[PDB]
């Protein structure tokens, strides 16, 4: 059985506790904890005491008596109470309220691709909304080859992402990989 154990424990009042435990072999043990985004100057306090372990279980009596159990299981060292359950505590997903910028990962869109005098808009299949789409050469090219001879917009299926680009900052569509363009059918047709 390994004899240090490292980890950062949760904290309540801080960005976490940073502990680390280490059973020397002459029976005794010395904890330490170092507390992250600490609140105080006393940020960082170390114990120590004698440790008596069973199959797994292991227990640690301080320099004042105070007992602290513990169940080792590989690697991991688990902090239970006294009845030997895990202590736990419950997670969540909540987003925190942030401010960055739209993300430049392509992700792919299926809109209606319309081109005429500089200007591209694609009325994405999904949301029903349109947006405008970044100017392309080859794209529009394309766009245009697809189209055949007339003013209606073909059905486009493209990777892209969202970015700002002023007033021709408004949110524009702006493609990350070449077109794939549809004629015959529309939107409604899976």
């Known amino acids: 059985m390994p004899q240090s154990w490292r980890g ?5 009042d801080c960005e976490g506790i940073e502990t680390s435990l280490f059973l020397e072999k002459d029976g005794t043990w010395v904890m330490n904890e170092r507390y992250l985004g600490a609140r105080e100057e006393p940020s960082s306090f170390a114990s120590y005491g004698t440790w008596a372990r069973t199959a797994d279980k292991l227990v640690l009596t301080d320099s004042k008596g105070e007992k602290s159990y513990y169940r080792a299981k590989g690697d991991a060292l688990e902090m239970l109470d006294r009845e030997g359950n895990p202590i736990e505590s419950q997670f969540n997903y909540t987003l925190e309220a942030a401010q960055s910028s ?20 694609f009325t994405d299949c999904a949301t029903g909304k349109r947006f405008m789409v970044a100017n392309n ?5 394309s766009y245009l080859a697809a189209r055949g001879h007339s003013e209606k917009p073909v059905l486009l299926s493209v990777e ?10 408004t ?3 702006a ?5 794939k363009f549809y004629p015959n059918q529309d939107c409604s047709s899976l």
């Open 8 to 12: 950062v424990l949760p904290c309540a």
């Open 102 to 121: 739209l993300p430049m990962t392509p992700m792919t869109l299926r809109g209606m691709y319309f081109y005429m005098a500089d200007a591209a808009t």
């Open 137 to 141: 050469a080859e794209l529009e090219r």
């Open 160 to 169: 892209g992402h969202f970015t700002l680009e002023g007033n021709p900052p």
């Open 171 to 173: 949110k524009v569509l």
């Open 175 to 179: 493609p990350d990989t070449a077109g």
